[PDB]
Curated annotation (Swiss-Prot):
The lineage of its organism: Bacteria, Bacillati, Bacillota, Bacilli, Bacillales. It catalyses: pseudouridine(1915) in 23S rRNA + S-adenosyl-L-methionine = N(3)-methylpseudouridine(1915) in 23S rRNA + S-adenosyl-L-homocysteine + H(+). It comes from Staphylococcus aureus. Specifically methylates the pseudouridine at position 1915 (m3Psi1915) in 23S rRNA. Specific for fully assembled 70S ribosomes. This is Ribosomal RNA large subunit methyltransferase H. Disulfide bonds: none annotated. Homodimer. The gene is rlmH. It is found in: Cytoplasm. S-adenosyl-L-methionine binds at L76, G108, F127, S128, K129, M130, T131, F132. NCBIfam families: PRK00103.1-3 (NF000985), PRK00103.1-4 (NF000986), tRNA_RlmH_YbeA (TIGR00246).
Length: 157
């Protein structure tokens, strides 16, 4: 029913923007798909832990302001549950079955997600043990959402 990608920062790369548009169109038919960006908190690149946390907290409070309290919140965390593609199809399916229709997948900025955003999570999803830049993570995520729908639908892909 509703699929939201709530991410930090914009995409300034045209190839990433073109890729997201492709998947957005492929997902259309299966679900409403929405992409919401919240501004990243502009800061130096070298920072104390103190400053790191302040940047996360500003980003996090804007992420949290966008999340309705009834939403199924899925946070992308390298330390979360590592689902196979079928494991994600099974996970989303089961939720839809049991009444959930509003899914918000969150992607943090360059310094990750604040613990507040992490405590709101309904499910921590890991895509890898490696670090993927947040702009490329957005492409990888939406392709993966399109894949899970195909799998939930028993469609070849």
């Amino acid at each position: 029913l509703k699929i939201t990608i709530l991410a930090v920062g914009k995409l300034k790369e045209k190839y990433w923007k073109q890729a997201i548009a492709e998947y957005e169109k492929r997902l259309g038919p299966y679900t409403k798909i929405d992409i919401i960006e919240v501004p990243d908190e502009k800061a130096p690149e070298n920072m104390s832990d103190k400053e790191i946390e302040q940047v996360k907290e500003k980003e996090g409070q804007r992420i949290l302001a966008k999340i309705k309290p009834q939403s199924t919140v899925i946070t992308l965390e390298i330390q979360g549950k590592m689902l196979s593609s079928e494991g994600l199809a099974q996970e989303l399916n089961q939720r839809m079955t049991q009444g959930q229709s509003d899914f918000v997948f969150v992607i943090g900025g360059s310094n990750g997600l604040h613990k507040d955003v992490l405590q709101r999570s309904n499910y921590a999803l890991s895509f890898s043990k490696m670090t993927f830049p947040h702009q490329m993570m957005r492409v990888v995520l939406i392709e993966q959402v399109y894949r899970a729908f195909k799998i939930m639908r028993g469609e070849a892909y």
